[PDB]
Design a protein around this ligand. Structure first.
Ligand SMILES: O=C(O)C[C@@H](NC(=O)c1ncnc2[nH]ccc12)c1cccc(O)c1
Length: 167
């Protein structure tokens, strides 16, 4: 038993809610919150900008040190950093950004990172301003992640569309 509330069960291990991931994190304090990162960990907008703002820019400061030491992530890759005031850890996952011309085929690899964590609070990868088809991303999530994932979808109209179209 865990502390998430009001989530809709989709499969054996995936739950979904129309909510702000920052507020779900402030409430639950999950072991792992997933950020929809880019390879440079430059947290400008979307999930990343929102999470980073909620940490008072501490996420960005930590991320800049990570990049200075390790160099950029790979598209499809991830790193574990602090969750600051939002969670124990933040799993920064790079899904392909279609608006950058990146390969949507790498979405499955991005979701595979979730399998290294027993429970996660996460956004839908490559959705929103990342420019991919969100229905497709939800399909990839359910067909790839085997650990327990709680998805927080910000846009209400998107949430309603995803639920009503889910197979
Ligand atoms: O509309 C959606 O769910 C898709 C969208 N989500 C959010 O921007 C978002 N999700 C949950 N909590 C949030 N709090 C503040 C913003 C926010 C998104 C954007 C970029 C990358 C990505 O993978 C997903």
């Amino acid at each position: 038993v865990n502390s998430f509330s009001g989530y809709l069960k989709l499969t054996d291990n995936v739950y979904i809610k129309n909510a702000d991931i920052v507020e779900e994190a402030k409430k639950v304090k999950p072991t792992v919150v997933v950020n929809a990162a880019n390879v440079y960990l430059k947290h400008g907008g979307g999930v990343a900008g929102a999470l980073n703002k909620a940490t008072n820019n501490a996420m960005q400061v930590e991320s800049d040190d990570y990049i200075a030491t390790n160099g950029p992530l790979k598209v499809g890759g991830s790193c574990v950093l602090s969750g600051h005031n939002l969670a124990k850890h933040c799993l920064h996952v790079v899904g392909p950004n279609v608006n950058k011309g990146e390969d949507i085929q790498l979405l499955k690899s991005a979701y595979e990172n979730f399998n290294q964590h027993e429970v996660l609070l996460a956004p839908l990868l490559s959705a929103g301003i990342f420019g991919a088809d969100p229905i497709h991303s939800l399909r990839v999530c359910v067909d790839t992640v085997r650990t327990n994932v709680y998805l927080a979808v910000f846009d209400k109209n998107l949430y309603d569309k995803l639920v009503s179209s889910f197979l």
